[PDB]
Design a protein around this ligand. Structure first.
Ligand SMILES: O=C(O)c1ccc(C(=O)O)cc1
Ligand code: FES
Ligand code: FES
Ligand code: FES
Ligand code: FES
Ligand SMILES: [Fe+2]
Ligand SMILES: [Fe+2]
Ligand SMILES: [Fe+2]
Ligand SMILES: [Fe+2]
Lengths: 405, 404, 425, 407
């Protein structure tokens, strides 16, 4: 059981909310590189921890991420002119650089120019995404390759969808092996075991766990191990396939919205391209998603669930495996009332995720280094994996690296 | 630097909100005359200071302005039948006249005489239906507004129902700095984009100048553009060589506003309604919907053309008012002035800020609300623009409104 | 100078039109292998040479291509039930197989020989290079299915963009044998640089020249012709020529100059006199060639954004192919997006069948004039017993191929010994 | 086998076509009563045999049917003012009455004798079982209007579904007189049998032909057959084997060479026969869901008649909903005039062959001065009906004494 209290604590990220402050202790993806386009390109809107952000790429190709509302009278910078090494607001011609310095003010003589600085965040570009450090400046750590993007020879293919529900349930969905055998029946293996035994192993960055199913052959002394990795506060590394690995990173746009990024990543000639990935997942922009990466599926059209399809044997009658997830997640409401839950042994990873985060948030709201920073970070040596193993090797012992070649 | 409380005091108008009661002391435009139509024409729904209203023209051709909801069981009168000197509710057949007197009650037999429905005194003028919405015994006699001398003048109005609070919209009216950037590609013999700002308080608001350096002779000359603020939310805008310009805003509620943009002057030099609308791109059925709501909106980024912008045009948006609309709206439903960062160009905005708070505070504690009485403006108050010698004061400049 | 006759002859394929009969001597791409889907999958409608076709994959996973209309009372088969080794009509239960045998008639007392006497027009089908092919010539004129010049064998990635263009085939192909246009029409797409090839990243194809007026040369051959466009390069055009060799494989295949990583082809299949299946292909090594979806997004021939369910283009004359007039003021040359979409806007506005009578060609057009002579010759010879052009021992194969290079002026482009871009080659 | 010539003759009805002249000898449904509305009600466009038509009910409530273009300068009368006992053209105010008399010309000093001088093409009309009928053949060949075989008298409920179909009339009737199809196409809708292969018989009459479909009954198959009897009343009526509670009827009127108005009727005792709206919902031929304002269907070739491919994989045979639409799909996809020349028929089409032969003869006969099939002494009467029962093979089905389902 959790309390309406702890639900609030684990879930809210807007404003003062602890989990928010804690989260901003990490680098965050603000948006996709493909959105910001060429030098001097169209400014893009984005949103993290309930703060509206412009992202533009100035003429020097530097990417800037700032408070959307211009420092003068609070008009939007998204309508601005990106040229000549700066974003210039439409109303009264103030022009900020990616750093947030105001280079000019077409309407003003004195020296207000030097002495006004606009909320701008240090940015970093990696693995097809635009990252920003959204917590206190002199706490920003240097940028390390995240677990699912070792270095820049790796192919990283991103699906992005802006989902209208709180982040926590979207992740709870990722560390739940039981469900692929149920939701993803008709989509997703050497085993037909529907009830996996679950084992956890706490770590410095989050945790590891295993789904132990009875394999199709020699269920006698063999186990089929599928092992997911939760990297706090909002990453999951999903059990890989024959050829590439799969990761989920979720960025809370606010209390009830979350940017959801589902990644394929491996050796470039074993890994799908971006546009292939999305077609598979049915998150293709303009067929599946609007121009903002908002799903055309929703409660109204019952996520295009096809009832005939279902009677024909197709399990969910919803096409694209994440869309199937979406259907479930979003019907749990804005913020899922964990208060009303009725968990079983299958939700072991889930109960770890709540315990761990509730832990690392109160701790943090009290002066502990926030879970997963400093000496402790996960790196590209931690990774999910799936194999068949003897019942007599520990799965934690298994010496797996991320799939490649 | 303003407090949150002041912004709330300056800005709110629904219910008892002081700025509300203050405004209701002036005559207020409720809607356009075009909307009301012929005698016995279709009822119009309109909204002022967070109160819903019917407007209908009866058989005699009297226009009324009443509470939208029937005095029986609060059904919408907008659905009623406007005929034979009354508006009759569909439901039970009660029939009010423009004055709010209940003439009949189809479904009942001395009640018909002793029930009044809220109606306000009304006046047509300059193509608008005006009402008085303050206490009945405070109603002035209707004087011409400073932008409609008498109705041999041509008054061509664009209306747009903007979904944001009233004040930020006027704030944009009194801001001569903005057109030097925003209306970069629409707007004058100068390119001084940073003009010295001068102000002069009055009994009815303020006059103010914007002192640009002219294309030639900015040794002993200033190009001066002067703008007049009539409280509570009216602004006389520097005219051009042919006709003058005015903006009056009526708060619909705390987060919405009727925005009337007016060209005015002599009928042979002032453009016609539809020409105006087409110019400012505020045409019903292309730029706006049947209720004068803009089809442009944040969802569609006001139809900004990003290529147009790479091709020289500053804003990418078409129709100088919509480029205004973009800014006003993006600041949010009520602009949080708390978080502002004003400069020398915003001197005019500050004056309004400061004057109106004085006025509302003064009024709240029982002063006559600013603009009433002896203190009124009338047609001789006006904006102007000319090249003025540096050795003359502009407050001195003796200018009347463009005509012939 | 061409004549109303010669045009009609060159262009029409419906009916007993010879250019039709000639064409049917080749294997024809009927539709995309992706359209037919799974065994017992929904049946696809298609159209070649003025004939309606059902294509389906049976329960054994065989692909049949047949006449669309049911042998019985001519109802559409595309509505029928594909199951248990056949396609069955909804009306009277007749069930054909991939071959054209009516294996059942549910209405008809099977106590008579009605079922074995009825044969329904089908064609021998083949699957290859991501496409379903059929032989729509006379039955025992059918050659063993040879690897096409742009799909060597099956270790090769082949990414296809399909677009059903609503004009005649011949203008579309004329488009592919025309190096001059790319320097005018595809100004803002094939942007000149200090390179040697034309990489991209959905960035741009490059090209080491800015010469818009290339010297043209031709070489007739058994299967059609090759030609070269000779551009002065940016650097040392003294004794160097940037060669770009396009190959025409008759009747309607264009081998287009490769870039750095992969090769480019075009194959057009006339649906009828005034419409044309246009397939535009990237092909080469699996790890250097774009995946299907990636290709389409670059070309803006994505189904459900650029094209509709049936691979028909959403851009048309009405919407002026989405011509962004602003973009044109701001620099982008055509103001239309996805470079084959630029081609289309032209080909289309020349009308259902270009009236080649009123043309006014230059030395830019030398390659097109070459296609016009050849095809009119080969069709005339064919109408008089001559083995249809590019069949038998005379066919192209995977050793014919386009190429680009800077070559010294004192080598003959015909002499250059090139192979299709692979990984090293 | 049939010939391009004959097909033409069977099918075309516009202009001078012989099948046109023959058809114009019978009373014709022009459109539903439900359309012409109250007196002074909005004028209705309609189209029979390639002639455009205005229908309107005047102040007295008489229903006129006229040529659509105003007699003056040929503007549409469908835009006209229907009041004060006349339809008045909007242009120059010429006003006609149902009978095609011009009562005034609002811009002419009509005080003399070129206001009566002008009649306007207008046909005699009758209201009956939900339908405005007109006789559009030559004046003096009009037979006094006898009750058709599916509406015995106006104490019957007659529930109609109308559908404007974009193909020639003939393939739409062929569809009605073809029992072979109900046990294949309508397999998941449509009986004490599972037999799909039934021995047909045909008997010609003066009005058309009767025939019997014979299925072996699910039980006692040795000396009993389940008889389904359909009656073709020419030119394009079909009486279709009834059910337990009501009878069925198809009449098709050619709008022209490549379109038909398809009227499909439920009829019987008022308390055993569906209401209009029920029928339409059952057949999915409801105006405003399935059909547009003009009874034109929203399912078409472009949207594959809403064929649900999954539903089919699920085992519902056609994956099209409402059994008439299963039919439409087939008929249309054959194309505007089925080229009967590429037909390859079998035993199951025995009836359709009868239809072909009869009509081809009856029109060559008509063209050479014989009476038009099933007119005068020859006509069908409400004594003619479709029937189905289980009968011994030792009664002649032709002889069976069945009457129309009622109670
Ligand atoms: O038909 C086409 O789309 C096409 C033809 C030629 C070339 C070229 O030679 O670069 C490119 C594209
Ligand atoms: S508000 Fe952005 S410059 Fe004035
Ligand atoms: S509420 Fe309007 S009369 Fe009853
Ligand atoms: S037409 Fe296909 S079986 Fe009757
Ligand atoms: S055409 Fe009808 S009256 Fe002139
Ligand atoms: Fe999932
Ligand atoms: Fe403005
Ligand atoms: Fe091209
Ligand atoms: Fe049927």
């Amino acid at each position: 059981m959790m309390t309406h209290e702890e639900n609030e604590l684990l879930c809210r990220v807007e404003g003062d909310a602890p989990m928010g402050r804690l989260m901003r202790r990490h680098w965050t993806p603000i948006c996709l590189v493909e959105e910001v386009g060429e030098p001097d390109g169209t400014p893009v809107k984005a949103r993290a921890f309930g703060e509206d952000l412009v992202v533009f790429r100035d003429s020097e190709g530097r990417v800037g991420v700032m408070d959307e509302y211009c420092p003068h009278r609070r008009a939007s910078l998204v309508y601005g002119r990106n040229e000549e090494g700066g974003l210039r607001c439409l109303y009264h011609g103030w022009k900020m650089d990616v750093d947030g310095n105001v280079l000019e003010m077409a309407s003003e003589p004195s020296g207000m120019v030097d002495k006004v600085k606009h909320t701008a965040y240090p940015t970093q570009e990696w693995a097809g995404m635009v990252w920003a450090y959204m917590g206190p400046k002199e706490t920003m750590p240097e940028f390390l390759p995240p677990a699912w993007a070792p270095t820049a020879d790796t192919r990283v293919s991103i699906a992005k969808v802006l989902l209208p529900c709180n982040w926590a349930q979207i992740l709870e969905g990722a560390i739940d092996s039981a469900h692929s055998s149920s939701l993803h029946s008709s989509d997703m293996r050497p085993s037909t075991d529907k009830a996996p035994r679950m084992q956890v192993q706490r770590t410095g960055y989050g945790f590891r766990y295993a789904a132990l199913r009875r394999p199709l052959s020699n269920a006698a002394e063999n186990d089929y191990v599928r092992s997911t990795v939760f990297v706090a506060p909002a990453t999951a590394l999903i059990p890989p396939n024959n050829l590439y690995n799969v990761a989920n990173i979720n960025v809370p746009m606010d209390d009830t919205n979350t940017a959801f990024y589902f990644i394929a990543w491996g050796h470039p000639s074993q890994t799908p391209e971006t546009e292939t990935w999305r077609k598979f997942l049915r998150q293709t922009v303009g067929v599946d998603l609007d121009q903002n990466y908002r799903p055309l599926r929703n409660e109204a059209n019952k996520f295009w669930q096809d009832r005939n399809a279902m009677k024909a044997g197709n399990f969910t009658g919803i096409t694209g495996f994440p869309n199937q997830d979406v259907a479930m997640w979003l019907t749990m409401g804005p913020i899922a009332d964990r208060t009303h839950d009725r968990l079983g042994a299958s939700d072991l990873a889930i109960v770890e995720f709540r315990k761990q985060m509730l832990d690392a948030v109160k701790a943090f709201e009290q002066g502990a280094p926030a879970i997963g920073t400093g000496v402790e970070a996960a790196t590209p040596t931690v990774c999910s994996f799936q194999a068949i193993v003897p019942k007599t090797t520990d799965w934690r012992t298994y010496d797996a690296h991320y799939v490649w070649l």
